[PDB]
Write a protein that binds this ligand. Structure first.
Ligand code: HEM
Length: 153
């Protein structure tokens, strides 16, 4: 369970993401695909993309990243009270997309990397610790739902 102080550190950096969610989204998914290329294979819609330049140029990818970060932002804003938000997300990611917990760890790494790079003013050590805790909570709660849904993860 995160403290209110920890949630405020999470939300204060998220406020900066929201200046330009699309640009942050592109950076995060591209970082994921670069660091862990196997993750790209889960996206039938995007797996044809060969290079960072192609990824950056894809309007379709950009739009998807906005969807992803907006969904995550809505979860974070619930400050742990995210049961309603996690239900549809866990179901689609377990049963339609088949995304293991390991891959959610990878995207968490990418989020932390991009925030660390872009936002040193709001992503010092304590703030990064808080974001790590928030993403760990998200992954733990998704993992529990995965199990309930019949997916090993
Ligand atoms: C922060 C974690 C993530 C969030 C918040 C998130 C959110 C979303 C949302 C909102 C959608 C559209 C609605 C839906 O199908 O549920 C989506 C679709 C999808 N997600 Fe995720 N996602 C996350 C992580 C991942 C990861 C790590 C992968 C793969 C490695 C992945 C694979 C997919 C795929 C393949 C789709 C369908 C794309 C399409 O063909 O339109 N997701 N995601």
């Amino acid at each position: 369970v995160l403290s209110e102080g920890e949630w405020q550190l999470v939300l204060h950096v998220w406020a900066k993401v929201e200046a330009d969610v699309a640009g942050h989204g592109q950076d995060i998914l591209i970082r994921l695909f670069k660091s862990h290329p196997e993750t790209l294979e889960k996206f039938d819609r995007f797996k044809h993309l060969k290079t960072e330049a192609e990824m950056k140029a894809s309007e379709d990818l950009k739009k998807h990243t906005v969807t992803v970060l907006t969904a995550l932002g809505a979860i974070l804003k619930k400050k742990g009270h995210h049961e309603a938000e996690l239900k549809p997300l866990a179901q689609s990611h377990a049963t339609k997309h088949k995304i293991p917990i390991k891959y959610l760890e990878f995207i968490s790494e990418a989020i932390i990397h991009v925030l660390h790079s872009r936002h040193p003013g709001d992503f010092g050590a304590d703030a990064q610790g808080a974001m790590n805790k928030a993403l760990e909570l998200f992954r733990k709660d998704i993992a529990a739902k995965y199990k309930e849904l019949g997916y090993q993860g």
